[PDB]
Design a protein around this ligand. Structure first.
Ligand SMILES: [Zn+2]
Length: 251
DNA sequence: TAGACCAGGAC
DNA sequence: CCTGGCT
């Protein structure tokens, strides 16, 4: 899931678990548990805690309990559902939190790429995987000034800058390409080559793009006509990822 | 800072 | 070979 989807999950999952008390935690693929390393410790510490909240940080979900925070990354295929303890589990269910009311929070992940870290709440933000995460794209903390300051300090591409989680939190490939298109900037441009007016336009489109999705011009459209100028959208490789852009609209 | 690395299986 | 985030 991308940031906007994770936010949707955060928003809808919360009412379904808030105020529920954990009675058991069952783990069927321990490698998903990253901290504590020992999955039995992970399971033992959660038992008895009540769910008090659910926040999002980039693409990470942060379940807030009484004493601990559970940091969860879905990666590709991770998904959460709330259902009855009386019904059979669906396939690829790897972690289940059982509540005292007979309902369960189930984690499914065909890829088994997702991760879970538990820490005392007060230290979750200074530990992996949250420790170095950049500001929320939709928050005041992520401003043109902040982007500009990171821009003029690096030699790498503007796309690579935007994909850097330390620069801005959870800005996916899709939204990087779309935002660059809307800002009229080639993904291959050196971040330092961007003008004050460009970084400002980029910031504005970043916020608008992710903001609209939370509440496609180029991504996956290669071969197809640009929606603004009719030029065939191109796809190459930039900073490891597939990169989509209009050779005419973007400079 | 550029890749390499890696979670696990898919075709 | 697909993909976000240690050498
Ligand atoms: Zn165009």
């Amino acid at each position: 899931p991308e940031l906007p989807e994770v936010e949707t999950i955060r928003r809808t999952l919360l009412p379904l678990i808030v105020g529920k008390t954990i009675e058991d935690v069952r783990i069927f693929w321990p490698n998903i548990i990253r901290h504590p390393r020992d999955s039995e410790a992970f399971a033992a510490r959660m038992i008895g805690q009540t769910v008090r909240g659910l926040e999002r940080r980039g693409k990470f979900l942060k379940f807030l309990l009484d004493r601990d925070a559970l940091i969860s990354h879905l990666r590709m295929e991770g998904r959460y559902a709330v259902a009855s303890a009386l019904e059979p589990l669906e396939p690829h269910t790897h972690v289940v939190f059982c509540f005292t009311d007979g309902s369960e929070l189930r984690y499914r992940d065909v890829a088994k790429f997702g991760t879970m870290h538990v820490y005392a709440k007060e230290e979750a933000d200074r530990r992996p995987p949250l420790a170095e995460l950049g500001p929320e794209p939709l928050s005041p903390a992520f401003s043109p000034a902040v982007l500009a300051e990171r821009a003029v300090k690096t030699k790498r591409s503007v796309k690579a800058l935007l994909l850097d989680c330390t620069v801005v939190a959870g800005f996916g490939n899709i939204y990087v390409d779309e935002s660059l298109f809307r800002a009229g900037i080639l993904p291959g441009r050196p971040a330092a080559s961007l003008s004050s007016k460009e970084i400002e336009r980029l910031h504005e489109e970043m916020v608008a793009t992710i903001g609209e999705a939370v509440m496609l011009y180029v991504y996956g459209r290669q071969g197809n006509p640009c929606k603004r100028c009719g030029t065939p959208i191109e796809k190459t490789v930039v900073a490891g990822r597939g990169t989509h852009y209009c050779p005419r609209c973007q400079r």
